[PDB]
Amino acid sequence: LAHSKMVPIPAGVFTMGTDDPQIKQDGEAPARRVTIDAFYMDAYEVSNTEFEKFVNSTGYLTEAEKFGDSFVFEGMLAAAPWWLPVKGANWRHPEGPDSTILHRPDHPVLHVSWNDAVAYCTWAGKRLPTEAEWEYSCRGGLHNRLFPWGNKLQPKGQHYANIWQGEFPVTNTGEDGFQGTAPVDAFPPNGYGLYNIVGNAWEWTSDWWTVHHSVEETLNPKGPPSGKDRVKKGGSYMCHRSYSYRYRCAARSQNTPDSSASNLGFRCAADRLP
Numbered sequence: 001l002a003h004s005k006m007v008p009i010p011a012g013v014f015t016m017g018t019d020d021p022q023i024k025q026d027g028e029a030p031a032r033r034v035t036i037d038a039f040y041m042d043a044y045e046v047s048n049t050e051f052e053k054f055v056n057s058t059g060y061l062t063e064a065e066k067f068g069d070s071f072v073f074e075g076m077l078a079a080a081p082w083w084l085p086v087k088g089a090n091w092r093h094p095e096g097p098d099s100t101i102l103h104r105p106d107h108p109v110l111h112v113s114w115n116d117a118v119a120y121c122t123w124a125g126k127r128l129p130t131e132a133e134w135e136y137s138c139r140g141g142l143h144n145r146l147f148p149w150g151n152k153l154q155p156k157g158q159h160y161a162n163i164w165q166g167e168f169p170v171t172n173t174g175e176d177g178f179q180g181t182a183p184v185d186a187f188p189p190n191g192y193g194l195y196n197i198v199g200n201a202w203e204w205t206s207d208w209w210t211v212h213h214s215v216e217e218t219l220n221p222k223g224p225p226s227g228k229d230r231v232k233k234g235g236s237y238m239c240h241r242s243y244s245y246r247y248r249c250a251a252r253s254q255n256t257p258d259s260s261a262s263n264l265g266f267r268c269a270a271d272r273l274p
């Protein structure tokens with residue numbers, strides 16, 4: 001296991017967003033050309049074991065632990081009826097107090113807020129990626145494709161990410177091998193060597209959220225200078241085309257920085273190797 005390893009993301013210019021938005025309300029459009037300097041991105045979502053090293057070192061108490069609850073999906077026992085605020089749900093107890101991470105050490109850490117993520121990444125000598133860095137990395141060196149690997153969901157009849165199969169929220173068939181999370185090194189890597197950049201856990205980025213973007217060309221953009229919610233990307237094991245088509249690199253959603261949930265984690269980035 002080298003689950004804190006990073007890969008070099010090459011310098012480049014890419015098209016962020018899309019002129020064929022699938023969820024117009026989320027500000028997927030307009031497409032815009034963005035220049036990104038070379039940097040390093042974690043290959044994997046941060047896992048339970050890796051977060052535990054952080055907590056062992058620092059004693060850090062996550063925001064969910066201090067608040068005393070976090071959001072859990074009903075099917076595995078609010079923004080929607082299937083999200084329940086569960087007392088005692090947190091990163092060590094992902095479905096509530098009588099759940100554990102002991103059997104899933106290599107799964108992504110969950111119930112981590114934006115502040116928790118920044119704390120971890122900074123402890124590790126890293127940072128959160130910007131939304132543009134994240135999306136560039138997700139796209140894996142391909143231009144204007146839906147997914148890290150291309151435009152087909154199951155290329156060559158193979159599952160390439162951990163999302164939902166079946167009728168959401170009543171039945172998850174586990175066709176792709178995982179009803180909940182998968183290990184952080186599951187599924188194929190994209191062209192840059194990243195795993196589970198779409199699906200598995202959602203991923204925090206550093207940007208404040210807006211839906212108003214210019215078509216102007218930009219360099220290492222950081223998002224708007226103010227806001228109330230931070231941007232998350234990539235979708236999760238819960239997503240399905242029928243209700244939340246957000247396992248595309250262009251997709252985007254938001255939460256207040258003190259929010260946490262059972263389908264939301266993160267990975268770090270860095271300008272240089274730590």
Ligand SMILES: *[C@@H]1O[C@H](CO)[C@@H](O[C@@H]2O[C@H](CO)[C@@H](O)[C@H](O)[C@H]2NC(C)=O)[C@H](O)[C@H]1NC(C)=O
Binds near residue numbers: 049053056
């Ligand atoms: C976090 O710290 C705990 C407590 O020290 C570690 O668990 C112990 O590890 C030692 C050394 O290998 C074992 O001898 C003990 O059996 C463990 N104790 C308990 C209470 O489980 C744990 O390994 C650390 N986590 C990480 C990811 O490094």
Ligand SMILES: [Ca+2]
Binds near residue numbers: 163180
């Ligand atoms: Ca799945």
Ligand SMILES: [Ca+2]
Binds near residue numbers: 045196203234
């Ligand atoms: Ca992910």
